[PDB]
Design a protein around this ligand. Structure first.
Ligand code: A1IMP
Ligand code: A1IMP
Ligand code: A1IMP
Ligand code: Y01
Ligand code: Y01
Ligand code: CA
Ligand code: CA
Lengths: 656, 153, 656, 130, 37
């Protein structure tokens, strides 16, 4: 009926005399504490266990009593840690000059705790002494404590006030630290919420440090500095997307992209397209002018990064417009030839093909297997050239094994000429699909193209779910229908399969069954395929129920789930779309800055005393950037909820 | 009307994918083009009761891939009278890959970004409509043009 | 290259001595102002046309200098409004003791402004002096002033502090006021944003007033009070959804719903349905028992509202399975009978049809004509019963003009027997669709059923735009294809239209063209319908392009638009779904509380002195509810950003 | 700050006119944004503009254009244009009579003032209930 | 003349809404610093 309540976690109660002592300390009564500490007769005094009359003194940051305990031999213990957390400078140096339960883990060090608070003044005061942060990497002996110690160390290293005070190159260490913390959010898969916040903090510090640049001279000194646009390439390597997409960094990049050319045009977008097509038409003239005279008024005009990109685009566009004129302009009746020689276009499309393979290999020397697969557009490029090698090789094989001409209806099942035609057609799809990557250069279609590919990975996760439901139902339908497989002789027009006028043998084999359930997603499989000649009503009804259940799961449940996660993913992506696109466009621009492979694929087939000064200039600019950043962040650190406490403390002095 | 411009940007992505697959299908199927005489009741193309010559020419191939968005192209158009199996299977795989990209990926992408745009537009809908209605009203304040077109001449 | 800056609207500047006067009052100095005022009888012309120091005295609520100024005849003007806005009680009553630019509109009065602030103490102070509020009704002039004046009046009447002080029945006036402000949010369509906030505030006041009830006796007094569950019925008519859906109001209603019969709260989900079924099977014996022995042990069982609901549902359910049995029991003998008499089923379902008509008329006159219309489940009931009248009447007519039997294949085109069969089948769909309304009684399917109907209006608006696009494209296709219309004789199986095996004449007439474009939404129109026998390639291509353009607009643009707004609407609706469902379930429950129409339709066709005390009890409870509400509101009105200012005021006295 | 701005303007101050772009691109862009951030001040317009409503119309439209041409600094220019659009709307919210509203909307610089608002796409100004 | 009245009302309202708790506490503390009596 009732629930009696008692104290289970019993404690040693403080005496009434002891409570008065702490009450006097809490009110700053110097006189009472002095007499109460005057009984040096060795009783109730402070021992290694203590009670502590110093934490409350630190709590109120009243310096008068705080010094009164220290000379009376009170066990300080971890008192310095409590002072640092309070962020009171006066109490910290008082305890510094005087050099069982705790609210701090035993791995916490005074320099570590100061960096956690990000207090510039206290961190600086501590570093004027010997301080050393342990280097992060024993996990088996105690795993909980090892993980917490590692996170505490990284939380101190990632402090903007510590980096600005003790890093030779604050920008570089923020790049490395942000990358390291991003990796740890995966390997240390349990503590990912705290490491990601630390990584985002390091990325902000470098971005805010360059925001203090006041002139273009300062900005170019930072971005062109070599450790031993070098600094901008390091930012791309570490995936510093916010740093790269800064308006001043983007403005400097556009100056080198357009170069002398007045490409900064933004008016009457119609004439932009008309003007852009002008250079593309005369692209071969620019290529030959550079080939025969690198130094000329028109010779170096192709050297412009924006002009070079247009020339390469028009050269590629000619290739696609060249294969398109191969089934509509050349082949009239030379199709009964068993093995044909390369035609007029094939001979005159061959140099384009060789340039692509040579260009791919020539850039394969830089980098290697790594840093190349992770670019998915290079995966497409590998497929085109591999397929282009197969059709070229398969064409000359049929040129030596066949000489006569026979009607196509009499050729073999796997004739080499037929195989090459299939491989060539697949390459044409891949070649035209590469024009999508050119959309990054456009400010209207760029963000959309980047967004489209940014969530194709969520599609792959779903298609693995669907591929298992498809295989489950294909097993059942084939296990029920394989008894009634009929030969192509008995079918009308000698046609067997689902590509006939009358679809038949839809579930006869497992290979056919997998295709039948694929085409039912688009409604291209008729319902009469669930019928067999034996007219066994029970068997046919069961098969139609398997087919109907598969349709409900796929077209009502799975595809509606797919729509649901596009909506959720697109909302998150749309916020970061502008930064993501500008990072991608930057990599496109820098690929045309360097002096290498400037000629189009149709033409490319033809085969220290100063360093000491530059480091001094970089350090001088870095010193000014840090000074402006520290002054700014100090101003924003002040808040009304903090000034009220200080204003109250000064107003306490009414004794006068 | 406020977000028909976003549709236009998407329709340029689709037109590039449409052109890529129409090139491959026409490059594979143009050898087997047949005359209208050899087809039943002298009908050639996909507008016939028995669809034929779906990928014979580039102009026909572009229409065939358009009508497959609405499911109006039958699957037997991937078959040819020669019956080389390998050629017909490759063509049906090009057709199937185009269907996945368009009807499962691109159209669902359009739905996702159409939902996001409508959220931002709906907040400003009242202000946008009242601005448009004001221009309608002020067009009838002027004295000129009072008479309707049947009498204004 | 420079923009000079000047003061364009410059007024008279305050001189040095006047400015010194102003800052003397600002700092609270008395002797300076007193001496300055005592010597300002000759050079300072303080009059009805002078400038003022009273407002700053009110601002710092320094009553001493404020009191001083009235002693020297300073033009007060509308300084009382400034004191009321500051919400300082001392300054208000001081200004009340003594009997061109302003920050207030000329229509604002002291009582109206006090109600805007919702300050209980100041409003009470002013009301004690016999104040009045103008009654709300463009004007002869200043339509702008009329709109602002009306909103200012309603902003004062809708003040909870004013209602609590000067309303005989605060709950009723909050009901009426909230309804009135909801109407004004449409008629005054320009100022809807402010009126909606006022209406929401009134609906909250009544809800928070009943939240102060502390016993079921108090709640029953409020809800059963008749001004001339009466008070709960008034809340339904004013659409007080939040008031009705309160957990204590819903709890009281539940005890009346289960009129002593077990509350059905500890039954299993599967067990729940099992013991619901047995009561339904016993409905025939319960109805007759009440008919012969109403005062019996089981005669009054049907009086319980929840039992009556189950009995009526089972009686209706028997009718639906009964129609379902009509098509599986009649022999094919009547197939050739021209005019058949009602069969075994038709004769034995006739009384149940009349019960629905009699019940419909009974509740039609009770609600009038406007209450009946505003219920979309009654439109279905009217249409369903009208079709049953036509079906019965048309069978009688066919019974007198036909006696023999003829095969149906040679029957007339519009035979009356055929027409009746079509009308009977349509009403069968409507009868079964009526079972959806029963979902409101369920806690799982209830909120979902209410959600589906809550935005069918948005579908209707969208379907009007689509119908105009459909009409536009049906005009062009018919204008292009009507030349090639062919007779049914020339078609293969004497079949004309799109309902044949080989579709033809899809766009021959406008009526056919409208159906063809409807069925193309679901993909049921084949592409060869764009082909005509003349084989004119130009016109056939044009027709297919207009057909293709319609498909893009409908199936890619319009239907995706529908999904977008249907998703946005669902997010807003889902927040209020629980309140909306509970309001709907309440109306369902109260319909079974009344004695009228206790018997199901199969059986329903068979043929003051005390009012003074009740008002006293209601007023006593209202007094306690208001007192608790005012105390809670006053306590909750305290804030950190308000308490600090008064702490500074007392601290600034410092006279010791 | 209305009081400090008025104090300084009385001492015959000036502001450079916004448009040299190649000597220092970073400094030129920041200088231009600083000038427009001062011109778009509601307290400066209220003190030193002959027609505050027309000034906010032109300035708000000019800042909208700059949010495209200066495509890199669009975030700061967008909130400056929105600030000018709000000022004109809030200034007309102080009308207390239909005579005052009719004087404003029918004024010809030489419903003329309402036609100018449609030209500059002042949608919030046009859609005001009054 | 109308513009002058509109600006005057706008400025008076703008000054009132510029007052805040986070700022009023500052000069409230500063006034109390005049504790010399
Ligand atoms: C998967 N499936 C299917 O394959 N077919 C084709 C069979 C061969 O053509 C169908 O017709 C078919 C079908 N699901 C269908 O809806 C149903 C049917 C039953 C249920 C449900 C849905 C849910 C899951 C809601 N539930 O509560 C039960 C009672 C189990 N129906 C229509 C149908 C057909 C006959 C009858 Cl007696 C009743 C309904
Ligand atoms: C594009 N495409 C197609 O065109 N057809 C028709 C061919 C001619 O009719 C199909 O049948 C077809 C098809 N994609 C299909 O699903 C697949 C198949 C394989 C994969 C995947 C999906 C994913 C991308 C998830 N992945 O991991 C792999 C392994 C590459 N299937 C069904 C099918 C058919 C035969 C087999 Cl052995 C296995 C599956
Ligand atoms: C409405 N419409 C249609 O009705 N048909 C059937 C005609 C009869 O069957 C189609 O084939 C068809 C079609 N829209 C189609 O895509 C297009 C085509 C052109 C454009 C666009 C989309 C957009 C609007 C993006 N734009 O920029 C232009 C250049 C105007 N195509 C496919 C097609 C067919 C032939 C060619 Cl040469 C090129 C493309
Ligand atoms: C034969 C078929 C397969 C060709 C396909 C036609 C189009 C889809 C292609 C052909 C030319 C391409 C264009 C070539 C050059 C440009 C200019 C380029 O301009 C920029 O915005 C970048 C330069 C700058 O503004 O700084 C943007 C991409 C664009 C429009 C390309 C986008 C894709 C286009 C229109
Ligand atoms: C029989 C077939 C053709 C289905 C078509 C009819 C159903 C849609 C109807 C018939 C009986 C109805 C039920 C009759 C009684 C109740 C009890 C009612 O529950 C309560 O009043 C207490 C339990 C709770 O709080 O949910 C909830 C609605 C429910 C299940 C009804 C929901 C709708 C039902 C299932
Ligand atoms: Ca490559
Ligand atoms: Ca009814």
């Amino acid at each position: 009926d009732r629930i009696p309540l008692q104290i289970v976690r019993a404690e040693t109660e403080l005496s009434a005399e002891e409570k008065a002592f702490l009450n006097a300390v809490e009110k700053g009564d110097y006189a009472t504490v002095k007499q109460a500490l005057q009984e040096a007769e060795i009783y109730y005094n402070v021992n290694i266990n203590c009670m502590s009359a110093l934490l409350i003194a630190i709590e109120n940051e009243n310096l008068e009593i705080m010094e009164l305990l220290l000379n009376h031999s009170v066990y300080v213990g971890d008192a310095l840690l409590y002072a640092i957390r309070k962020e009171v400078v006066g109490a910290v140096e008082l305890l510094l000059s005087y050099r069982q339960f705790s609210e701090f883990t035993p791995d916490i060090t005074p320099i570590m705790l100061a960096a956690h608070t990000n207090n510039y003044e206290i961190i600086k005061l501590l570093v004027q002494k010997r301080v050393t942060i342990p280097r992060p990497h024993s996990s088996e002996v105690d795993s909980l404590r090892h993980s917490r110690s590692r996170l505490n160390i990284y939380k101190a290293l990632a402090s903007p006030s510590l980096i600005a005070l003790s890093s030779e190159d604050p920008i570089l260490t923020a790049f490395r630290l942000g990358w390291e913390l991003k990796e740890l959010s995966k390997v240390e898969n349990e503590f990912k919420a705290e490491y990601e916040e630390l990584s985002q903090q390091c990325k902000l510090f470098a971005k805010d440090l360059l925001d203090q640049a006041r002139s273009s001279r300062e900005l170019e000194i930072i971005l062109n500095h070599r450790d031993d646009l070098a600094k901008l390439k390091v930012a791309i390597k570490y995936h510093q997307k916010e740093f790269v997409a800064q308006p001043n960094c983007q403005q400097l990049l556009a100056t080198l992209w357009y170069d002398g050319f007045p490409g900064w045009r933004r008016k009457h977008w119609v004439v932009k397209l008309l003007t852009c097509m002008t250079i593309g038409f005369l692209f071969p003239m620019l290529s030959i002018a550079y080939l025969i005279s690198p130094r000329s008024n028109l010779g170096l005009f192709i050297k412009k990064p924006f002009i070079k990109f247009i020339c390469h685009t028009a050269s590629y566009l000619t290739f696609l417009f060249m294969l398109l004129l191969a089934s509509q302009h050349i082949v009239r009746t030379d199709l009964h030839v068993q093995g044909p020689p390369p035609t007029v276009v094939e001979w005159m499309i061959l140099p384009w093909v060789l340039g692509f393979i040579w260009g791919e290999i020539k850039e394969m020397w830089d980098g290697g297997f790594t840093e190349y697969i992770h670019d998915w557009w290079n995966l497409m490029d590998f497929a085109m050239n591999s397929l282009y090698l197969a059709t070229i090789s398969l064409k000359i094989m049929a040129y030596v094994k066949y000489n006569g001409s026979r009607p196509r209806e009499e050729w073999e099942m796997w004739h080499p000429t037929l195989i090459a035609e299939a491989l060539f057609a697949i390459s044409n799809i891949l070649s035209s699909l590469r024009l999508i990557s050119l959309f990054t250069a456009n400010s209207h279609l760029g963000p959309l193209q980047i967004s489209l590919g940014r969530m194709l990975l969520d599609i792959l996760k779903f298609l693995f779910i669907y591929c298992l439901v498809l295989l489950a139902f294909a097993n059942g339908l084939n296990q029920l229908y394989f008894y009634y497989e009929t030969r192509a002789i008995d079918e009308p027009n000698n046609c067997k399969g689902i590509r006939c006028e009358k679809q038949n043998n839809a579930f006869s084999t497992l290979f056919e069954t997998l295709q039948s359930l694929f085409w039912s997603v688009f409604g291209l499989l008729n319902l009469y395929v669930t019928n067999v000649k034996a007219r066994h009503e029970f068997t046919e009804f069961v098969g139609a129920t398997m087919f109907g259940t598969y349709n409900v799961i796929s077209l009502v449940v799975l595809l509606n789930m797919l729509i649901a996660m596009m909506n959720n993913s697109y909302q998150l992506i749309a916020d970061h779309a502008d930064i993501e696109w500008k990072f991608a466009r930057t990599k496109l621009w820098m690929s045309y800055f360097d002096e290498g492979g400037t000629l189009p694929p149709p033409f490319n087939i033809i085969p220290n005393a100063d360093s000491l000064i530059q480091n001094q200039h970089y350090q001088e600019v870095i010193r000014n950037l840090v000074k402006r950043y520290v002054a700014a962040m100090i101003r924003n650190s002040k808040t009304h909820e903090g000034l009220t406490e200080e204003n109250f403390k000064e107003l306490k002095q009414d004794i006068s």
